[PDB]
Structures are given as structure tokens and as C-alpha cells.
Symmetry: C5
Subunit: 319 residues, 5 copies
């Protein structure tokens, strides 16, 4: 029989970790089997007055009386759970929903944890990508470091995954915010005992508070998405600049090679003249003395003149 590893935080912040059979959990929470399938990444739903949330590896069930974290093992959640959550829920944590019922504090804690995780991913990726791009777009490098290219590719893949996570988080929060029915449903304590809260709520609107909390987290996620999109745009612009730099270096090297090739061609032409005039054959110019110096002088001078003329021709061709 499948089981859930459940960490339960009550309204008093006490932590109880145990394992419970899935059928027993369904019976306790008043939920069906399909409700706790957790097959969707980044899904927030309300079933039978219970808030089922899944943010990647974080699966949570919020009740009017307690919070349950499921399948928390082997995820490095022990520090976060057993240090922050008791303090955030029933201590001096940074949560600003203390006068509000427990579900507001639980939702705020979960959304704050996910926002902090996304912010940490972005704040790890951004300096690495920035320094890699700065190293790569250096104008004085003829060629780029390919190990840094592999690092940039891995970081870009991580950035795309992070951007997708931010996008789906924003989509879920926005689709919850758009409909007032979902906002009303999220107030589980209000609907658990509506008769009690008809007079308990001394002019305070739970739906308004939930809307404000979700809007705050949506705005934070929107800022994260804008930063990630800016980073992606910077990556693309840096890649274009790298392409232009490599092409410019190629053109410079090609121009130098062409000039040297013109020089070599002129030298080879007059070397052909010299070797043709210096083969082991009887001629009528061996007796003359000035002929050797005249030939070598005209060879060198013509090589220089042809090289200069070819350089001028290249300059005219390239304008």
C-alpha cells in the first residue's frame, strides 16, 4: 500500500513527522484519491475545503487547522521546514498575516518559500552568465574559450527552465486571481464554519486579504520573469556581438593573408624568372658581367613594384 511521508504543522506551530497510508490520509482529510495525485507541476486547487498546492517537488495540503507537507524526504527541505516554518507560523517570522486565519499564514509561507527559491536560482545564474558573457565578448580575443561556451550553454538551459517555472507560477497565481470564486474558495476557514465567521469577521474581508497576498506574490514573480527575460535578451545580444567579432577577426586575418599572398606571388614570379635564367644550359649572356647584377636588380625591383601594385589593387577592390 502506497504511503505519504507527512510533516504536519498545527496552528500552534508544532511539528509532527510521520508516515500514513494514502487511504487513511484521504479519510482524514475528507478527500478522494484523485485530489492528491499531484500530477501537475505548479497547481493550486481547492477541493472539499482543502487547499492542494504543488510547486515542483513541494506538495502541500492546507486545512483550516493544520498544514501537511508530503514526500518531503531527499529534497533538502529539512532545514527550511524544521527551522523556518515553526517560526513563520507561530513565532516572530516575517509573515504579515498573523491576525488572519491559519490558511493565510500557510499560503504566505509556501508562496514565500517558492519565491525565495526562484530568486535564489536567478541570483545564482545571473553573476555566472554575466561573467561568462563578459569574458566571451572581449574584443581583443581572436577566438573564444569553448569551455566557457559549454558553461554558457548549461547556464542558458538552466535559465530557460527557471523562466518556465516563473511563467507557470505566474499563470497559476493569475488564474486564481482572475476569478473571485477561487479567491472565496481559498478562504477555507471562512467556509468551514460560515455561521461562526458571519459574526467573527469584525469588518475584515478574507477574500480581499487573499487577493492582496496573491497580488503581492504575482508582482514578485513578474519582477523575476522580467529579470530572467532581460538576461535571455542579453545572452542573445552577446551571441550576436560574438559572431560579429569573430567575423571581423576573420576578415582582418584574411586581409593580412591576402597581402602576404600577393607578396609571395610577386616573389615567385621573379623567382621563376631567375631560375629560368639560371638553368644549366649554354646561353649567350654568361660572358657579360653587368648582366647578373642587372638581372637581380630588376628582379627585386619588379617584385617590389608588383607587390605595391597588387596592394593598390586590393585597396581599390575593398574600397
Amino acid at each position: 500500500a502506497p504511503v505519504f511521508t507527512v510533516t504536519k504543522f498545527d496552528k500552534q506551530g508544532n511539528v509532527t513527522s510521520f508516515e500514513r497510508k494514502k487511504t487513511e490520509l484521504y479519510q482524514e482529510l475528507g478527500l478522494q484519491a484523485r485530489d492528491l495525485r499531484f500530477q501537475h507541476v505548479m497547481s493550486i486547487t481547492v477541493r472539499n475545503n482543502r487547499i492542494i498546492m504543488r510547486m515542483e517537488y513541494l506538495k502541500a495540503v492546507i486545512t483550516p487547522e493544520c498544514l501537511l507537507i508530503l514526500d518531503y524526504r531527499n529534497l533538502n527541505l529539512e532545514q527550511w521546514l524544521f527551522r523556518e516554518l515553526p517560526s513563520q507560523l507561530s513565532g516572530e517570522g516575517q509573515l504579515v498575516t498573523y491576525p488572519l486565519p491559519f490558511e493565510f499564514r500557510a499560503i504566505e509561507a509556501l508562496l514565500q518559500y517558492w519565491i525565495n527559491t526562484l530568486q535564489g536560482k536567478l541570483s545564482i545564474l545571473q553573476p555566472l552568465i554575466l561573467e561568462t558573457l563578459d569574458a566571451l565578448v572581449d574584443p581583443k580575443h581572436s577566438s573564444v574559450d569553448r569551455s566557457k561556451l559549454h558553461i554558457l550553454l548549461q547556464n542558458g538551459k538552466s535559465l530557460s527552465e527557471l523562466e518556465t517555472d516563473i511563467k507557470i507560477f505566474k499563470e497559476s497565481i493569475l488564474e486564481i486571481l482572475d476569478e473571485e470564486e477561487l479567491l472565496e474558495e481559498l478562504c477555507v476557514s471562512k467556509w468551514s464554519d460560515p455561521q461562526v465567521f458571519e459574526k467573527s469577521s469584525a469588518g475584515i474581508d478574507h477574500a480581499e486579504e487573499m487577493e492582496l497576498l496573491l497580488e503581492n506574490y504575482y508582482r514578485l514573480a513578474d519582477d523575476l520573469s522580467n529579470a530572467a527575460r532581460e538576461l535571455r535578451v542579453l545572452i542573445d545580444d552577446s551571441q550576436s556581438i560574438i559572431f560579429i567579432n569573430l567575423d571581423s577577426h576573420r576578415n582582418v586575418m584574411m586581409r593580412l593573408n591576402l597581402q602576404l599572398t600577393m607578396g609571395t606571388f610577386s616573389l615567385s614570379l621573379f623567382g621563376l624568372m631567375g631560375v629560368a635564367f639560371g638553368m644549366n644550359l649554354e646561353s649567350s649572356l654568361e660572358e657579360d658581367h653587368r648582366i647578373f647584377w642587372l638581372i637581380t636588380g630588376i628582379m627585386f625591383m619588379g617584385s617590389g613594384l608588383i607587390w605595391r601594385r597588387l596592394l593598390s589593387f586590393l585597396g581599390r577592390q575593398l574600397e
Copy 2:
């Protein structure tokens, strides 16, 4: 007369395969000819209290009493139909709509099959594309394997087709979910005998259950679309990295070729000097003895010095 190859599953899960004339099928189902044209890929409609669904090659008609699969031959559907569907509909299948009427189970089975097909396509494409990209973006390869390029092109075309299929599936599900009239129409058993279901429905809302089922499948398809889009983005980034790697290797090879060309040019210049000074002509320096060693020494030393000067010039040019 055109005919349909019909596989019928009753509410008890019994399977009956036969062939029926199209007019007879229209008369039996209370449908017109235009309803069963099946000319749209990924279309879900409700006509005369019958649910007509088409997911590419899968054409189905859901009635309050039975499910019909049409044109199922030569599509490798025999295994799925004759093994899963009886168990899913009237057995111990994974469907979570057993207390719900038959149309809920049929819709769940069809949507689950299509989602599984898309997931299988994605899970086949993803490892192949990942390994091909990993092989191609290897920084230590001067040139890429073009057979792997052809494989990557074919897999990218398949990925684009899969992404289009996921997109149209999401569009159909979302356009059904947006309007409450369509959700009400999908509950064919409710509207077949409204008087009976006015009291049969003991506080259970069929429209709500249909909305939950369609939302679950829409979220699954959204996850699939996000994964496919991430794969496409990774393909594009890998292609950019491949371009940068190839350009960097070209620049390195060009720099080496330019250095060797400078060396060859210096050697050719002083070889021109030597061949000019070594032609079969009478000169005034054959008698001298130190002249030969002086000439060869200055030739070699000048070749080296000119090569070093040209190397420094290249270094200055490339900064």
C-alpha cells in the same frame, strides 16, 4: 456504400467489433451525415446528445449507453482497445470516474490515451535530441557529424509536429472549458433523461466533475507543451553554440595558417635572394670564400627576423 468499422463498448465493458453502413450508423445514433464527417483533427463536439471526438487517427462517438471507435484498423489500436479499454471502463482501471456516468469514463479513457500518446512521443524524442545535441556541441570537435545533423533535423520536425498536436489539444480543451454551455452539453446522460437525473443526482454536479476532468487533462497537456517548448529552445541554443564553436575553430585554424604563411613568405623572399645570387652567370664574387657562408647566414637570420617581425605585426593587428 461507405461503411464504418465500429468497435462498441457497452456500459458493462463488453467489446463488439463489426462493420456498419454509414446511413445505418446515422440512423442508430440519431445523427446527420455532416456530424460524422471527421474532417477536423482534434475536434470535440456535442451533436444530438452525442459526443463526437477526433484526435488525429482516433475517431470516437460517446453515447449515454455505449462508446464507438470508428476506422480503428491498420492503426495499432488493437492492443490498446482490446486490453486497456474493457479494464478501464468496467474493471480495475486507473479511471477515477467510476461513480460518475458512463460518458465520464469514456471521455477520461480517450483523453488519457491521447495524453499517454503525446507523453510517449515526447519521451521518445527527448533522449534522442538531448544525446544528439550533446554530441554536436562538443567543444573539442573541429567539425560536426552531419549524419547527426540529419538526425537532429528529423527529430526537430517530429518535435514541431508534436508541439502542434499538443497546442491543438490544449486549444480544444480550453475552448470547451471556457463556456459553461459546452460543459453542460458534455453531460449526455444528464440531458438524455433530465426528469430521471433531476432526482438521481444526489447533490453531485455533473458539470463540475466534467470541468475538473477537463482541467486535469488541460494541465497535463500544458506541462507537455512546456516541456516541448523547452526542448525547442534548447535546440536553438545548441545550434547557436555550434555556430560559435565552428567560427572559433575557423579563427584558430586561420591564425595558424597566417603564421605559417608569414614564415613561408619570409623563406620565399630569402630564397629569391639565394636563387638570384645562384644563377649560372659570371659574377665578381665567385673567387671569395667567406661570401657563400655570409650569404647563407644572412639569408637564414633575415628569414627568422622577418618571420618574428611579421608575427609581432599580426599580434598587434589582432590586439
Copy 3:
């Protein structure tokens, strides 16, 4: 005075072709001059209980009693009109709106013709583009065929035009479908004599039938748009693969040229040694016999060793 070449199909399918002055046509149809300007490509409007449709070169006016096609000459419409339209309207055509009034049949015929035209354009473009891309992305070609590149460019321009046509058709159909007022207006026979159709309509809803017809054609156009977009994406991916193939071939050729340049450089260095040691000058090593063989042997061996060392250096540089 400007005139219209009018082809009129009555409810009985009879065809009458003539020419009529524009003012006379306005008086007959009960329309103003601005209604029949036909200045918008792909526009469907209802003015004075008349349906004015324009699909590029096809201008039509649908009345409760007749259909008019205007400016049909020099457009290869004679075959379509004078063969299909009588059969589709008042024969055994594939139209599924025979029990419906005449305007439904006319709208179905026009939309079917336009959908068939778009499908024919796509089915002509797709095999040509596919075969051109298959020829171009061949991995064993060092260079691509530029005539095929020109053909691909022309076909891509045609594909973009077709995609724009499909997009505007979808936009017009969707904007008609979104508002129920437009759907009600399209039923010209219903509003021509509302008193008669108040009892003539035996439980059949004209607006619902019009909505179904327009939805069917919108779905067909959506499938066409998806196919065209897939073709464009395939074109872009093939272009990227062509770029990678060309760069890889360039890198391979550059590596071969660099190896041959290293060999030539070593040969030229030791040829400089030989020519320097073989100039017409008196030396102290002409008397020796083993010196010639020693010099040539060390020249060849050193050329080989330097070539191998430079090859190893290139291998180290390219990793």
C-alpha cells in the same frame, strides 16, 4: 458609367450571366454605393439584409432569393461556376445544407470554394518545398544548388502569402462567430419575412446552423494555418541545418588546407637550405663526396619531422 459583370444563380440553380450598370445593381439590391466598393480583401458583411463577401478576387452578393458573382471574368472561374455551382446549389452536390434556406447553401459553397483554393495552394507548395529542402540539406554536398535556393525563396514567399490569406480568412470567420448579432444577421431569409419564418421554422434554429457551418470552416482554416506554420518552421530549421553543414565543410577544408600548408612550409624551409647550399659560389665542401647525400638526407628527414611536429601542434591547438 461603371458596370458589373454579374453571374446570377437563383434558388433553382439556373445560371444567368450579364452586365449591369452599378446604379441599376444598387437599386435592384437595395444597397448603397459604399456597400459594393469591395475595397477589403476577405471581408464578410451584412448590409440591408444582403451578404456581401469578398475573398481576394471572388466578389459575391447573397440575397434571400439569388446569388450574384461580380467581376468573374479573366479569373479562371468559368469552370468552377458553370460546373460546380449549379450542382452544389440545386443538384447532388456535397453541400449539407439542403433543408436550410438558400443563403446557407450559398455561404457553404463560397466558403468551400475558398477553403479548396487554399488547400490546393498548400498541397502544391508543400511537395515542392519538401523536395527542395531534402535536396538542400543533403549532408554529402559541399555546396548547395543556388537555383534550388531561388526556387525555395519563391516558394517561401508564396507560402507566406498563403499563410496571410489563411490568417485573414480565420480572422473574418472568428470575428463573425464571436458576436451573436452577426450570426443572426447572416440569416437573411429569416429577417426578410420574420412573420412568415416565425411559424415556418419548425423548431430549427437558423443561427445555430450558421454557427455550426462557420465553425466547421474556421476549423478547416485552422488546420490549414497549422500546416502552413509547420512548413515555415521546417524551412527555418532546414536553413539552420544548411548553415551548420556549410560551416562544417568549410572547417574540414580549412583543416586539410592547413595541414598541406604546414607540409609546404617544411618543404620550403628545407628547400631554402638546399638552394642556399647550392648557389654558384666557391665553398669548402665541394670536394667531399658524402656531404651531398648527407645534406639531401637530412633535408628530407627534417622536412618530414617538422611536418609531423606541426601536425601534432595543430592537433593540440584544436584539442
Copy 4:
């Protein structure tokens, strides 16, 4: 004191050009200072029953009795104003709003002028861009004409500006059309004396006529936007084809250079053999006669054989 150069057209089409202080204009029109700031490009608003329109350099105020054009000098508007506008408003112009009040004619004239301006810009840009692209994508050119590249860049910038203008025009017209309140406000003559027009309007709806006019101009602008987007897509496709053509020409030239380099390498190897065997040193093979012919024959034959072997090696490498 700032002043406006005002050209006023009455309902009778008479033209009066003058200059008026801004405060006097505000008092006459019953408008505040902020209404006539004209700080937004392509803005259509209704303030105090006056229609304030700005289309780039064209600033207009439409009153129930007159039309005012402001800051018309030094804009080449004299021809358009003083030739078209009197005829369009109170003559035989192409306006189709003569039975409608004056504001309909004024709005039609202004929108027609702006649409004509955009159409003229597009009809000037399109042939130039088309001919430049046709010249540039010529497959038989090894290199492209860079002056034509500069012309294409300037025309592309102009096309982007025109596309932005069309987009903002469409946005303004669509945002006016979406809300019925704005359509009602645009009928300034209706709201100037509502008691009079309560009986003056003999069954004619001013809001409907305004909606039809704005829809017509929106459709014209949509056609313009589609044409401009098609032109941009064609520019991008042509640039890609140019890239492929240049890379293919580079590959062809590189293959030729590599073949010639292989030939030169073989010739240089056997030239090294010859020069080593032809240095001024005493050897044991000068006496023999057949040795010279044997050496030269084997040199030439080996050069040819090595060249052919290297050509085959290149063919194998490039497949």
C-alpha cells in the same frame, strides 16, 4: 503668446486661413489648454463635444459646424487642403457620407487622407525593396553590392517606421470601435442639440454609421499592415538566402583553393627533390646520362600521382 495657424472649413466648404492665439482658440472651442496639447502621435479623442485628432503632423479639431487644421505650414499640406478638402466636403468628392452630418464627412476626409498617405508610403517602399532584394539574391553573384545593402537598410528602417504608424493607427481605431460610448461620443452633432436630433434623425442611426466608417478604415489599415508584414518577412527570407549563397560561394572557392594547394604541395615536394639533387656538390651520378631524364620523369609522374591521390583523399573526406 503661443499661436495656432488655423485653417477652417465650414459646412459649406469655404476655406479661411488665419492665426489665432491659443487662449482665444480655447475660448472659441470651449476647450481647456490640456485638450489641445497634441502630445500624442495618432490620438483620437472627444472633449467637450469636439473631436481632437492627431495623425503625426496632422492636427485637427472637428466641431459640429466646422473643421480646423492646426500647424499646417511647412508640411506640404497646402495642395491637399486647398484642392481636395473643399471638393470632398462640399463638392463632388469621393466621400460617401453626404447625407450624414458634417462631422462624418470631416472624419472620413481625415481618415482617407491618412490611409492614402500610408498607402503611398507602402507603394513607394515596396518596388524599391523588391528590386533591391531581386538584385541581391541573384545566385550568379559571388559577392553582393554593398551600396544596395545600404539602400536596403534605409528602406527597411522606413518600412519599420511605416509599420509602426499603421499599427498605432489600427490600435486607435480599434480602441474607439470596441467601446460603444466612444462611438456615441464621436457623433458630435447628435449631442450638440439632442432635442433637435431626437426628431431630426428619421430612423438613421449615427452611431451605426460611425461604426461602419471606422470599421472600413480599420480594415484598410489591416490590409496595409498585412502587406507591410509580408514585405518584412520577404526581407528576412531574402537575407537568409543571401547568407546561404555567400556561404556556398565561399565553400566552392575554398574547394578550388584546396585542390590548387594540393597540386602546389606535390609540385613543391618534387621540386625539393629536384633542387636537392641539383645543388653545387660533387656526387656519383653526374657521369650517368639516363639519370637526368629518369629523375625528371619520376618527378613529374610522382607530382601527378600525388596530386591525384590527394584529390581522391579530399573527395573521400567531403563524401
Copy 5:
């Protein structure tokens, strides 16, 4: 205890700068701690009849009686605050909301300052980017200046950041404008003493004035966004033109190098002939006199002929 550096402007324009503990500020403004967290860039909200605005570094709280600027130090805001704001609020400033209550003037001043900041950023970036692109796309440059490339990259990053800022400003203004509840909430003076303003408002609608002000600033931001997008499109087009120019220069240089390589190959072939015929070996053609001139003449003529034939071959290959 954390404190705020508060600059307060009353309705009379008087400026008072001080520091106040955060709890004291919360008590004075009737706000909770979470309201003044200022964790969202570009957020406009209304809490407890107070307008909380944050535009990057500018944090402001608008009350019906006063305006507060928080954390204004070390931001170069002293000039703007202490020179413009007193004049804009209670002087001869350009604000057009003097008859309106104080909150209208404060909102107008803040939005005007942010719009001016964005306009200044755009007007600084645009000339720099334009001149850099004009320098880079010069057709007569074989290679581009890489320092200008780095400058262009930095300016493009700044432009992307500015475009993101404009986008978020537009999004906030538009989401405020879409809902009438937010527009009503922004009129803090109206809701502070509704009984007084029930008769104080002599036919003037505060919500309408707020909507007009926000629409004006939204249109200004839309113009800014259009200009920034045009600049980005121009940057991309210029980069494409730079790529084409570099490739064309590469092709020209490669063609010249190939022609010179063909010439060098022909010269080297006939130099091989000469050196083979001029080695120190006994032959049967030393006695002849015309043989030397015949050999050198045929060598030169054949070199020329082979060079011309290879040039023709290249011309045929490149078409």
C-alpha cells in the same frame, strides 16, 4: 529601528525634510507594515485611502493632505524635488490639474517625472546607438571597430532595460485604467469625506479626470515603447547588414586569393619544369644554344596560358 527619510510637501507646496521611525510613519498614515514594504518595482496601489507608488528608486505616498517621498537620499533627487515640486504643486508649474484636488497634482507630478526620466534615457540612448550603427554599417570598411561593438552591446543592454521599464509602467497604468474600481479608489480626497464632496463636486467627475490623466500618461509611455522597439528593430537590421557586409568582403578577398593562388600554381609548375631541367646533371641538350631560350619562352608562355585557363575555369565555376 528602521527609519524612513521623508520629504513632505503639503497642499501649499511647503517642503519639510526629516527622518521618522517606520512604526511612527505607519501610525501617522494609518497604514500597516506590509503596505510600505516597497518590494515591487513600478507598483501603484491604494491602501486605506492612501496612494502608494513605487517607480524604481522613487517611493511616494500620496495623502489627501500631503505628499511623502521616502528614501530620496543618494539618488540625485534633490534638484528635482527642491526645485520643480514646489513650483509644480503650488506655483506656476506645467501641471494642468490645479482646480482638481491635491492628489491629482501629486499623481501628475510623479507620472510626469517618471515619463521625463524615461524620455531622457531614450534621448540619450538613441543618438549614441544611431551613430554607432552608422559607423558600423559603413560599406567601405573591410572589418568593423570592435570597441564600437562593445559600446553598441552596452547601449543595447541599456535599451533593453529601458524598454522593460516602459513596459512595466504601461502595464501598471493599463491595469489601473481597466478597472473602474481602481480609478474610483485613486480619488482619495473624494472618499476621505464623501459627505463633503457629495456637494463640493459641482458637476465635476474626479474619476473621469483621473482616467484622462492616466490615459495621457499611458499614451506617452506607449509612444516611448514604440520608439524603443523601433530602435531595437533597427539594431537587429543593422547587425544583419553587418553580417552580409563582412561575408561579402570575405568572398571578395577569397576570390582575389584564389586568383593569385592559381597564378602561383602555374608559376610553380613551370618553375618545377625549369628546376628539373636545370639540375647539376649531364644531359644531351647543353650543347644546343636555342634550347635555353626555347625552354624559358615556353615556360613563361605556358604559365600565362595556364593562369588564364584557370581564371576561366573559376569564372565558369562561379557562374
